[PDB]
Amino acid sequence: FTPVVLATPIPEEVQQAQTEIKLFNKWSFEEVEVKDASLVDYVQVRQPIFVAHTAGRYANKRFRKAQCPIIERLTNSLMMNGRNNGKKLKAVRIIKHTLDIINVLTDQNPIQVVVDAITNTGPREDTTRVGGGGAARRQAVDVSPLRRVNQAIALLTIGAREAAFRNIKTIAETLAEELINAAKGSSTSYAIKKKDELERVAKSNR
Amino acid sequence: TPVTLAKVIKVLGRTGSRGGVTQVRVEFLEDTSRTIVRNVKGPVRENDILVLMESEREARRLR
Amino acid sequence: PGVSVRDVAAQDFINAYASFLQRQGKLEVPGYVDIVKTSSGNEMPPQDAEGWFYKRAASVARHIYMRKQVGVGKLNKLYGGAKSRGVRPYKHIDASGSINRKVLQALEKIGIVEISPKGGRRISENGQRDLDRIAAQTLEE
Amino acid sequence: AVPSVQTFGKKKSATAVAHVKAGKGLIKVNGSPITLVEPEILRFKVYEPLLLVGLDKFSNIDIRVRVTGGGHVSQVYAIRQAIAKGLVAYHQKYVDEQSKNELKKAFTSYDRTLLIADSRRPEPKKFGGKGARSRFQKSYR
Amino acid sequence: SLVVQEQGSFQHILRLLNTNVDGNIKIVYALTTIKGVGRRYSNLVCKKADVDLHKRAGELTQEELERIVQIMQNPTHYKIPAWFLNRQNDITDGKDYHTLANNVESKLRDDLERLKKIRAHRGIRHFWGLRVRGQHTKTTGRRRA
Amino acid sequence: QQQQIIKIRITLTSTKVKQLENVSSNIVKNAEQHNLVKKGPVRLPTKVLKISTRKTPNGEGSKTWETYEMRIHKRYIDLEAPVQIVKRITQITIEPGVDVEVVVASN
Amino acid sequence: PGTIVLYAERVQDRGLSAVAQAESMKFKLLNGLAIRRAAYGVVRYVMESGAKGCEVVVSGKLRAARAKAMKFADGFLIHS
Amino acid sequence: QHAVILDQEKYDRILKEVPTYRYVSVSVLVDRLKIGGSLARIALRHLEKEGIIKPISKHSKQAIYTRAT
Amino acid sequence: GRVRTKTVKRASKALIERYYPKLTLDFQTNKRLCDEIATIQSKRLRNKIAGYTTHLMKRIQKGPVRG
RNA sequence: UUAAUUGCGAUAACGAACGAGACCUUAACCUACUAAAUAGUGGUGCUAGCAUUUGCUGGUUAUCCACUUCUUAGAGGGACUAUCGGUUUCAAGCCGAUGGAAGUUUGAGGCAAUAACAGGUCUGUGAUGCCCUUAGACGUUCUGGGCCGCACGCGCGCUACACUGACGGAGCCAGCGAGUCUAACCUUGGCCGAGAGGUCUUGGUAAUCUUGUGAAACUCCGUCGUGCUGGGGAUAGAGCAUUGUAAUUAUUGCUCUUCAACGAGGAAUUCCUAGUAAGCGCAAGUCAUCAGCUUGCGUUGAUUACGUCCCUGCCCUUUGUACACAC
Ligand SMILES: [Mg+2]
Ligand SMILES: [Mg+2]
Ligand SMILES: [Mg+2]
Ligand SMILES: [Mg+2]
Ligand SMILES: [Mg+2]
Ligand SMILES: [Mg+2]
Ligand SMILES: [Mg+2]
Ligand SMILES: [Mg+2]
Ligand SMILES: [Mg+2]
Ligand SMILES: [Mg+2]
Ligand SMILES: [Mg+2]
Ligand SMILES: [Mg+2]
Ligand SMILES: [Mg+2]
Ligand SMILES: [Mg+2]
């Protein structure tokens, strides 16, 4: 709140961040509460990060990746399809642009929008093959909250990647309209369509 | 469509031909003391809140 | 108050120094600019046909300023990149020696770099006139 | 002479060495201000040790950091670990213990890597594949 | 480092060295539809002609286009250093030529029967339709040539 | 000849660290009770000579590789001693498996 | 000349030397001693010399066109 | 199939349509108008020049603009 | 993954048999006392033996351990 | 119950040995020890160049002092799944949390039992029985050619199908190596040349010099703008070089030109659980020249599951056998 002067001049905009850790420098993690219960403690907010790059060990334990911040899990699912393996700096730039584009649209907080999209597009019922081979059946099961969060990020990023492929629209924007459509609930988004398909098969295969 | 919310008390075990399902016992958050056993596909543990499209169905694939 | 070429970001220093050299008009651009590729690992000439030599000169002057001694072979490796070998995989290829050598000779003729008794080229006293004055003007603008 | 500590931070192969002496607010990395660290999108990774505890407690300090080894990401993580550990070590030696504990708790609350080096090391490659675990493709026919 | 506007005095597809050069392509890459003209050659020719590199090839005047053709046809006369050309040290007269659109097919054909009439190995391989640069023919080239 | 500085450097190289450190200890001790001004034994980085071979004398089998290693340990000590006595004490008792190089400097 | 000198010294505890025993095994086999008799002899000589264990394998064709192996062990032997 | 050369009709359409765009970028100008990417990059800089579009993020490979104020 | 081999279990068994009064519930002093009451050829094996001895002493504090 | 015939137990068995484990090597910790002009750092005897008035830096160790944090390597220490809780026949153990450099056998390996396979190698061996040949030779050498030959079938791969990109400019960061006087090896710097390369010197038998191997991916700013297009780079022409006695059947490199398929791939199928997969290069082996190969190394760094016996394979128990050259 008050300027402190150092021999190396620290800019005002980065000196403001002392009072509150935001994302890159803008988005506050407050008022990003997960409306859909059963996904709290599997959608990780309430520990702000300045940037979606935290070289964390979320793979040693089973449920440890639930504590990874949901934006970083979004970035990790972005840097995908072979030619992009690694390249988290690229994925962090895409996510920074994506969140700006979301706030340029839909003036509401882009962290909230991505959280809504995650909650809205995680399938709640799925199927599983029973029987050794094609001559078998499909039996419906319920989906754990961790798998719902996992599959939500998978469907959202896979749809954004396929939309951005072979067209003028960049990956940051295709991800932005994919998140905005999934946040509202529109069925014009890839993730909502696939989730609706998965639940439809599950109810037909109960 | 009125989906219902339940909380996992116990993780019974692993069912399915390939073990990809987990049997759990759940209690209803709304109208508690209502306890059923469900099949779950993803990684699950105790206290997990799980959303069921329909409530009246007992898990049939055991052992 | 003191400003060196370390308080200024690299890109916006090289841009401003190259613009200074261009408006100063004594860099002695060799002449075979507009045809050379700056590397055999490249396949197109620089897109800034008129100012790319000045960018390269400012980049080399800053590189000398940060280091102690730099020769042409060091510059050739530094400005070298990956070469697309077609059906074969990529490989590092050094940049053009003649461009780097003539850039260094040009900065000698202007007084930015010196003979450097134990090697190649070294930053000059006037070299740290101009680079520091540019750094100050870039910071305060 | 002047109170000073010398600490280090280590990512995979990158090592940043931080000299932290009594001063008036210097925070330099390889002779350049902390505000110029690259890559630009990871700037706040090296801002975090500054911002997590307040800038008021860098006001009477000179910090100079030199980082080598590793890569563009690892050097940033080594830098931020060096700065955090240097602030804690300086307060351990020349400030009172409560201040050192509150700095240590503030850093650890956000990231353990800020003070503890990540222990993950590369797994040696094995014959019969391109990686530690991956194998060559077999065909059976 | 600057960005400038432009105005639409434009022509669509234009004949050039008996080749349809498509407008709406930036001039350096539009000229590459002429055989014998590559990206390096087109860029150098445009720089020699003093044509602006950002003119879209449908907004060049006739005199600029004829200047471009004059340079592509006599590159040596405008200080193109002859290591930059199609046909250095020509086999039958020793002069350095840069072959253009229809001559590219023609003098490729001349290179063919010259070897084929001296019965050189490369000419014989060309006659049979096989590889001529020593590739292994056991497992590749099995769907054409 | 009589209590004169020599600027000697004794470089010890071997593949067996135990005996290499015995000779190093002997040199440092003989400098110690003879009251020398010596630069302690500097240990250079170990050199690992690696040879990677296929195990099969023919080519049949799973492609199994061996990496044989030779480890070379290098140390050196700097002394300022009269030549005669240290020559007598260091020419003698040269332990096997350790190569000793003694060189005079004009620094 | 003089820069190289050759000395010899006696192998103390001869029965604990694999190379020496293998050479004596070879000589007895070359002379014509039966494979078992020579192998047992080496085995019990190494045992008598205080060895923790000994093992002698003989492989090849032994009065038959087919070739086989036979082991002669005594005492304690480790492998890994 | 796209307008690489700017004429008065498309220029007037740009001056009427880019205002009242919540989000403006190269892809938006290429899609919602019919100009090419090169023209869109020239247009984005030019419309910033008088300020009918406001810049939010300045990056190569992604520009983010919005309505002025 | 942490099952102790009979060599550790037997050594700790014998140590408790003849050195129970000298032993404690603390691994640090238990390994410091394994150094003097037993000859173990490895520091890692000694750490395991003293760790299983400490574990069996903790078990002994709540009812006897069979055998 | 464990990775384990690893154990706890049950018990006509008891006590043992090999194998497993232990061990060894390596990776990670040590502001605690021993020290370093072949590692580094701070002051400065001595300076010195700045912009300024101390921030950035260049220099000398009888052309200085000091020190060991970072590096090195000797000796040691450190983990024993510790503490706490839960659970188990409350045992072996398993799980979670805390702490910790480290808690997946701490990671990865090296070694690795018995009994075998008519597995491969007589084309590694001056290992070798027997057979064949031994002067018009199947010995050896020399010249030339072939091993690469191309209707086609299959396996390991490289490069791609693009904008999460190509291209241009700028930023610009590794670790593992190797290297010549026991002859030309690794090559800085200067000069010339678009380039490949050439040329004159230099340092290094090497923590010293190449080399901070200034690697590529990557970052930023631009150009391009969904068009087989400035994706892709096969095929082919002309020319300049380098290695070598010799380059034609193009050794390889470079320049300009030609600019194919290919728009994400069928039935089928491989590898993989964390610094792993994948991407990206670098060194080494080979090597006069030649890597799209291998062996290592680092750089960037996921997603998913911590499970089951459905498929495949292997092991065990019960069982049937007319099999034991063992389906
Ligand atoms: Mg796109
Ligand atoms: Mg054993
Ligand atoms: Mg073992
Ligand atoms: Mg130390
Ligand atoms: Mg066989
Ligand atoms: Mg062959
Ligand atoms: Mg290095
Ligand atoms: Mg094309
Ligand atoms: Mg291309
Ligand atoms: Mg070309
Ligand atoms: Mg060859
Ligand atoms: Mg090979
Ligand atoms: Mg298989
Ligand atoms: Mg029957």
Side-chain angles (χ1 to χ4, degrees), chain I residues 1-7 9-10 25-28 31-32 41-52 54-56 58-59 62 64 66-67:
Chain I
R2 280 84 165 92
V3 184
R4 269 67 62 95
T5 300
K6 69 204 174 273
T7 187
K9 298 193 159 180
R10 281 167 72 101
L25 273 69
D26 178 54
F27 162 86
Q28 293 308 309
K31 70 173 170 66
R32 285 304 205 247
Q41 284 304 279
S42 177
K43 180 210 277 163
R44 163 166 188 234
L45 182 64
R46 169 213 81 208
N47 282 340
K48 287 194 199 301
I49 289 159
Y52 198 66
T54 313
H55 162 79
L56 289 181
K58 286 169 90 76
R59 278 192 62 212
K62 317 189 194 179
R66 198 170 41 211

Side-chain angles (χ1 to χ4, degrees), chain D residues 10 12 28 66 72 112 123 130 133 137 141:
Chain D
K10 280 193 204 172
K12 287 182 267 186
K28 297 273 187 78
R66 305 265 150 187
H72 288 112
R112 182 169 188 239
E123 197 193 319
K130 291 286 168 193
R133 302 294 173 77
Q137 162 156 306
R141 57 89 174 173

Side-chain angles (χ1 to χ4, degrees), chain E residues 45-113:
Chain E
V45 163
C46 292
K47 294 200 201 97
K48 290 322 188 69
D50 291 331
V51 160
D52 194 46
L53 277 296
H54 182 74
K55 296 298 290 294
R56 194 61 63 180
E59 293 179 353
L60 294 175
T61 58
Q62 295 297 109
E63 293 83 3
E64 286 162 2
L65 297 157
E66 182 65 26
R67 193 146 87 266
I68 278 163
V69 164
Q70 189 42 264
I71 285 171
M72 315 199 320
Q73 288 188 302
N74 296 115
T76 284
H77 187 273
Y78 314 85
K79 277 73 69 177
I80 291 183
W83 49 264
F84 190 79
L85 298 195
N86 289 319
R87 204 170 172 91
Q88 295 164 267
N89 219 343
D90 174 272
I91 188 51
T92 194
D93 63 358
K95 300 294 187 291
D96 293 339
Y97 307 84
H98 181 86
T99 312
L100 287 178
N102 267 312
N103 310 126
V104 167
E105 293 82 3
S106 78
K107 293 187 286 185
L108 173 57
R109 186 269 186 189
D110 304 71
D111 302 321
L112 267 291
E113 64 278 14

Side-chain angles (χ1 to χ4, degrees), chain C residues 49-77:
Chain C
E50 294 294 328
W52 77 259
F53 195 80
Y54 300 85
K55 298 293 183 182
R56 175 54 66 85
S59 171
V60 166
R62 196 187 150 263
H63 204 83
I64 305 280
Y65 183 102
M66 317 282 264
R67 271 92 191 153
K68 309 179 205 254
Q69 290 101 15
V70 193
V72 181
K74 293 285 172 71
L75 297 174
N76 294 355
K77 191 179 203 173

